[PDB]
Amino acid sequence: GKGKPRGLNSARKLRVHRRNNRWADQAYKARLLGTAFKSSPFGGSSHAKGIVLEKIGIESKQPNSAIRKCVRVQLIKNGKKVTAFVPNDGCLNFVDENDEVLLAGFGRRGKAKGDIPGVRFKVVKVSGVSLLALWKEKKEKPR
Amino acid sequence: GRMHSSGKGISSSALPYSRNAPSWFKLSSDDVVEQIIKYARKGLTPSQIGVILRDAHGVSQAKVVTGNKILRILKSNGLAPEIPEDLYYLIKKAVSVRKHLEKNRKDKDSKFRLILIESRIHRLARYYRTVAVLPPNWKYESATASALVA
Amino acid sequence: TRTSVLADALNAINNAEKTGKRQVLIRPSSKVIIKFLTVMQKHGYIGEFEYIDDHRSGKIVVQLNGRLNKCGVIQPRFNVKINDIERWTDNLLPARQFGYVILTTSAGIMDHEEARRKHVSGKILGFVY
RNA sequence: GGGUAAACGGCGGGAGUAACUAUGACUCUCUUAAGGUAGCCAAAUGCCUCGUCAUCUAAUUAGUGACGCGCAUGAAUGGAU
RNA sequence: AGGAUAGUGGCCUACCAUGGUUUCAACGGGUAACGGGGAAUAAGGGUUCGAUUCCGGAGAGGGAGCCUGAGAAACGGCUACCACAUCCAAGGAAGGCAGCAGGCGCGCAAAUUACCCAAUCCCGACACGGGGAGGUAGUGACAAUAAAUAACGAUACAGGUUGUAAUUGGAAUGAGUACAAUGUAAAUACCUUAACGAGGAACAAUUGGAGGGCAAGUCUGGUGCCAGCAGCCGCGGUAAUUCCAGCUCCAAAAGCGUAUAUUAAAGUUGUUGCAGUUAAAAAGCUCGUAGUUGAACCUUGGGCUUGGCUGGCCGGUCCUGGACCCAGCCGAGCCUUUCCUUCUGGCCAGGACUUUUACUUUGAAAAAAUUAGAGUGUUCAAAGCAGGCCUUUGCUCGAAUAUAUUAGCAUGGAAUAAUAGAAUAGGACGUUAUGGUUCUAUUUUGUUGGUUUCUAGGACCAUCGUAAUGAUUAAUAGGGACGGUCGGGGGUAUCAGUAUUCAGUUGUCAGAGGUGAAAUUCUUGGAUUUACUGAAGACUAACUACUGCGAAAGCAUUUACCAAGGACGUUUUCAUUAAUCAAGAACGAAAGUUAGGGGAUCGAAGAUGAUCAGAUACCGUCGUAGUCUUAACCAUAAACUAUGCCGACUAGGGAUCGGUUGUUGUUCUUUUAUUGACGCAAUCGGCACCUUACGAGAAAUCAAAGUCUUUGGGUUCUGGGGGGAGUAUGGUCGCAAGGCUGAAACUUAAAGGAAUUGACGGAAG
RNA sequence: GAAGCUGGUCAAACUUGGUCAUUUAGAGGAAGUAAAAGUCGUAACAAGGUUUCCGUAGGUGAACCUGCGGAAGGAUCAU
């Protein structure tokens, strides 16, 4: 009845069974295996500083037809090269090649967002100044 | 039901609610006891002794007449088998099917039955060692089992 | 195999009570069953029940009245401390004003209200409402 | 007239063709008894040739690992291990 | 046994045994691991975190070794090496911030080289010194508490006695600014406070949005699949409710978004509390070990007396208190055939005995802090444990109490689950039973010390006497025995049967075969066809079924043998011997592999004649492995009832198989019985089928897929969106083919289940 | 009673070797995913025009075909 042990001396069989079946859960599996510590470009971090290498315009996924303007950034903490989005009408002009850009997530937590193919990060600050403050022109880029 | 099968049959005996010897029964308590012993010396197993008692001599239950079980009478008269009857017959059948196998190697059904029979022997033998009927070192070996059922 | 006669008893009681039958046969009987019914009988949930002797485990014929909602066992018989009862009552019973938790104790088989009066605790044994 | 290849043995050419080029899954074409299959290769078998790439070294016509339209590899004239 | 140690101990040595740990997870590996008190989140159960204000431990760059000392294997002690590293006059000398502040690097990520022993406490020869311990200040939107940017009139239109919307005022006040006093070791700050300090009271509130989720526009202009937005669905291709601007409005407010991780949401990790016929998921099937779980049964009832608190009646009322009365709910104390240890001093204290538990009450414990929580007007609050008193040469509530929870201690109880006893009696009592065997000794006869017999206590041994002398039922759990059966259950030999092919004979004579149509092919060297004779291998037609047997895979000619088996019958026998089961075993369709034998027919591969644009496909003709068998492997199938196994109950009905139990206008044996068949009533077990839905389900459907939010019979296995992928790798089994175990990166918003409508069909009517 | 000396003991450090673990290069090979639907065909979904699917073994440009044994999730609950 119910297929799982119920006898009073069967607390062990339940302890092993649950712990085995928590591995099918990806939240548990990602945490214990430490895949963030190994294969995630930030290394489990929230933000990261990196160095811009080249600027790229990407064709959009269907059915949207546009260009998402991202950049090739190499990370200073571990030397990895991954693409980051530049989100603001006309904020491609604020970022130049070989600038240090503070990146963050898309809120999808390691997943591609929307119609943008192959990109998971966005630029938060350039040269130590927020790209939102530059888009609103609250401040000016240091140069 | 059917420990080593899938059957669920219930055919069995139904002892009467009455635990007292019938009115028409004229034999005394002891006369049955030596009558039991007389058939005991002819090699008849307790199952056979009880069967021949009711069939021809009118003993419905030996416990309701003598007060004691058929095998319990045998033990107190030194006639209880060393190998208990059910264990004895399981081992003898195990030998006979085994002997059938050295002439018929391709009888996979016979091999499967033999595993079931010896599976039954060891479970019944484990019981007789928890209750000190057999020595605690008792072991069934197929090679020389025919010595015990000889 | 037959692992608990108490479970087989209340189930056949429930499988009769929903069916609207006014009597049900319980097999086999036992002291735990007989004392269980008495706690149910002194609360009117069942009627005059009879014990049949067959020189064996026994049988019980119960009379049903229709005031029984659901009677079931709690298996395994969890150990219940005096501070463990309020959790068992909340989860098993529909309301705070009726329904009972049958506990087997060193003082005997009793419901949680008679258990709290004499402030003794044992293993939980079932429920009735 | 039939059979037989663990009998002797044999086992093809030319064109165009894929939203760059390159190549050609593909198609057309002449022709055979069949058109070299599985495999393997600059191999003790490759002329061109010190083939091209990698590795070995400071430096390697040597060696090894790959590549393969292979002058002229290849299955008991046994193939590959 | 020794040495060494402060001391026990393989801590070390010598000698001698071969032990110790482990599926109840040892040992090994990882740890983005110091542990705990605690933190976050939480209806509950839980999940994640804990470097870090307390406790315990370890370390001072990595090791190692020692001096002093009660106390160190110390690093703000030394020595040596390794790695760095400072000066050097080049001979040498000196290092250790994981103390305080501070400097570089690393990063997404983190403060002044300030003051002082005044408060807390420590150290010293000590009322006196020292303390980067500690305290105070500087930076600090880590968090938390309280809490400003206004208020009320008069006009004025609108308006239903007043809510305002504009232009008209007089007040109040702190934000700030400062005498001064307080505050302090000295200051800053807070609080008090003279004077200054508000009409746009510019002393100006921000953060996000306004399609949905989700609160707030279909307003205007710009762009025109572009820019871009959009967590997701999508918005943008010239009227964009969604981008880019303005206006308006919304949510929170000195606070508001973003990213990451985690908790709730998540009953998407499910003990409470998931799912497994079809959506992912019941091992091919049996055996079986550990483990989990395991029928019932042993003092109940009766009777009497008594203590306690609830409701009243009493009322006895300043809500409150008494016997009697009623019950109720507990505690007892006796008698009932009576457990409840047993003696001495005499309910406590001194002795002698005890089946083990598990469980549960209570007690003691579980540090402080943290949490809950008592009291207490820190102006409230966060707090803090202060405080309050007619103003005190002092009086005075306090500074609780809970929760902790596993292990260990004590304690009351005896249901539930175990555990033990009396079967070849080695059993229990004789308290003072008889003796006998031994052992211990206080006390003697006191002038002191030797003699062993009474004696007392064991501890046993033999005899006799006691007792109701001593064994629970046989579970519609099991196992076995026996009696007639029943099976297409298995193995070995043997007996048919036609058919197929091939051959030999006999007969004609132009075709035959094959297809939708043909051609390949065989044919006047007689094909096809005919009859008979003969040989090979396979396979057992029809009977043949909503029929049987088997763990499953499977099993269909006869007979003989061999050993098994289920069900039924049983007033036979043993008494729990059982259910499910990690690990481990047996069997396991077809195909495939190895070696012999057989190879009729079919027939992968191959070759072939058609069809076609092409088909080396479907169609046709041959054909090699194979198909069969004997020895061994393989271990997989849509191995399916896509439904684990065991157990109980629930609703009607009729057929059928094996058994067994009572019975016919029936035919037959044989002319009848004790024949058989048939027919009618029953029950056991099956394989199933029909209706209904009490109920279940997303539905199809389901007699189980019910007895599941009214969530608990036992137990095993399995699943956690779709791919990648049953792939890679490692291990392991196999001759090989392969089996078993088995990811990740990456990628994606769907994939899928049941059913409805339509559309479509080279489907039926 | 200093340096020194003998033998021991604890043993830093280096060399060699073995091992385990974690990263990282590589000619070439062989996959997977994405893109847009470039080339060839039409395997599946209707009886999908040869019913489909499972296991296994051969073959083939590719989808796939064929054999042998299964299943109906069949196009049959029915003679």
Side-chain angles (χ1 to χ4, degrees):
Chain A
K2 260 178 184 173
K4 57 177 157 187
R6 269 211 200 108
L8 199 63
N9 292 342
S10 63
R12 172 184 292 113
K13 180 71 180 296
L14 300 168
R15 171 174 38 90
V16 174
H17 182 99
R18 170 62 49 240
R19 179 223 293 157
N20 287 358
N21 278 343
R22 302 194 71 185
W23 283 106
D25 192 333
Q26 285 324 276
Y28 187 81
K29 184 162 211 172
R31 175 154 49 90
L32 270 76
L33 288 192
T35 181
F37 203 75
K38 327 279 192 52
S39 183
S40 293
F42 290 171
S45 308
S46 82
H47 300 69
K49 281 166 201 173
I51 296 307
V52 175
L53 303 186
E54 62 172 313
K55 298 192 278 188
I56 190 66
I58 302 168
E59 294 293 328
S60 192
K61 282 192 258 178
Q62 288 183 257
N64 288 8
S65 178
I67 295 295
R68 298 291 161 222
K69 297 179 175 63
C70 319
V71 288
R72 288 306 297 182
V73 185
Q74 75 91 27
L75 293 185
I76 62 169
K77 70 197 297 180
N78 52 23
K80 296 177 178 175
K81 288 168 195 168
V82 65
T83 314
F85 191 60
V86 189
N88 243 342
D89 208 325
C91 277
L92 186 71
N93 312 323
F94 293 126
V95 61
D96 298 331
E97 293 179 353
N98 316 305
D99 271 332
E100 187 173 2
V101 291
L102 176 75
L103 308 190
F106 282 166
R108 296 209 77 199
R109 306 173 301 103
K111 198 55 62 175
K113 153 185 167 309
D115 62 86
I116 311 167
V119 180
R120 292 180 179 91
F121 324 112
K122 72 182 163 189
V123 172
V124 173
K125 296 161 69 168
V126 56
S127 294
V129 177
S130 168
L131 210 56
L132 201 76
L134 290 181
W135 184 67
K136 292 181 181 179
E137 286 90 7
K138 280 168 164 282
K139 292 77 182 173
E140 287 79 7
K141 197 175 157 182
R143 190 76 269 160
Chain B
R2 300 309 90 68
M3 183 177 176
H4 277 160
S5 185
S6 48
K8 310 277 149 61
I10 67 159
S11 76
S12 88
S13 298
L15 272 72
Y17 183 88
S18 173
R19 281 170 179 172
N20 312 136
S23 61
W24 49 261
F25 196 66
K26 293 314 195 320
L27 291 185
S28 77
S29 164
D30 294 19
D31 176 325
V32 184
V33 170
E34 293 83 4
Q35 183 62 255
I36 284 172
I37 294 168
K38 189 192 69 64
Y39 283 115
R41 306 196 181 265
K42 297 178 180 65
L44 307 196
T45 187
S47 301
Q48 282 281 36
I49 293 167
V51 160
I52 191 66
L53 274 184
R54 62 165 165 80
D55 273 4
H57 211 182
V59 179
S60 64
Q61 289 279 319
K63 178 183 166 56
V64 310
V65 177
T66 75
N68 274 250
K69 291 184 128 209
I70 291 186
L71 180 68
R72 192 190 302 282
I73 300 169
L74 295 191
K75 200 209 179 193
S76 289
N77 300 291
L79 290 159
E82 183 178 1
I83 311 293
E85 166 206 275
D86 57 359
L87 184 56
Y88 182 76
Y89 274 109
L90 274 176
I91 300 171
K92 155 184 267 196
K93 195 193 278 306
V95 164
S96 187
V97 57
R98 194 167 279 285
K99 178 178 68 65
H100 161 90
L101 266 183
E102 293 83 3
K103 300 178 295 300
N104 304 261
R105 183 65 274 162
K106 286 192 283 189
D107 201 345
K108 281 148 181 173
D109 183 27
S110 287
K111 173 175 181 182
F112 179 79
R113 296 302 165 184
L114 182 53
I115 298 175
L116 284 189
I117 296 163
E118 320 206 322
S119 308
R120 208 174 307 124
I121 279 164
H122 291 303
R123 296 169 85 161
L124 187 59
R126 188 175 70 240
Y127 174 58
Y128 284 145
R129 281 192 316 254
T130 64
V131 298
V133 168
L134 293 170
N137 59 278
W138 178 260
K139 186 192 259 204
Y140 161 73
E141 65 274 16
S142 68
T144 63
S146 297
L148 324 172
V149 298
Chain C
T1 47
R2 207 184 288 263
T3 61
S4 170
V5 304
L6 184 69
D8 297 351
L10 300 199
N11 174 263
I13 289 179
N14 277 320
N15 292 355
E17 174 260 338
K18 280 73 176 175
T19 289
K21 298 186 182 302
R22 299 304 92 201
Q23 74 278 21
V24 62
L25 188 153
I26 288 176
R27 190 191 80 97
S29 172
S30 67
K31 293 181 296 187
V32 183
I33 286 179
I34 286 180
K35 302 188 299 296
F36 211 100
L37 292 178
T38 300
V39 182
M40 299 222 291
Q41 188 179 64
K42 66 182 175 66
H43 283 306
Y45 286 94
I46 65 169
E48 190 276 331
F49 55 93
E50 188 84 30
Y51 167 87
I52 293 161
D53 189 358
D54 49 352
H55 278 166
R56 276 155 182 103
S57 298
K59 299 183 191 180
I60 292 188
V61 168
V62 177
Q63 294 299 319
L64 277 297
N65 58 3
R67 294 179 292 173
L68 180 54
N69 280 291
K70 182 67 181 294
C71 60
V73 304
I74 297 302
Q75 184 63 255
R77 310 184 167 168
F78 294 97
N79 291 267
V80 183
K81 294 182 184 293
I82 282 181
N83 287 323
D84 292 355
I85 304 193
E86 72 275 14
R87 296 294 86 193
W88 275 109
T89 55
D90 290 2
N91 297 343
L92 294 174
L93 278 298
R96 322 191 74 249
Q97 301 91 3
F98 72 104
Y100 288 147
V101 176
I102 318 289
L103 308 167
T104 178
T105 318
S106 65
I109 289 179
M110 64 184 73
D111 59 359
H112 77 265
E113 293 179 353
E114 293 179 353
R116 185 177 65 246
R117 264 181 263 126
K118 64 179 73 174
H119 204 74
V120 299
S121 194
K123 300 161 174 294
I124 193 164
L125 191 58
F127 58 97
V128 59
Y129 55 90

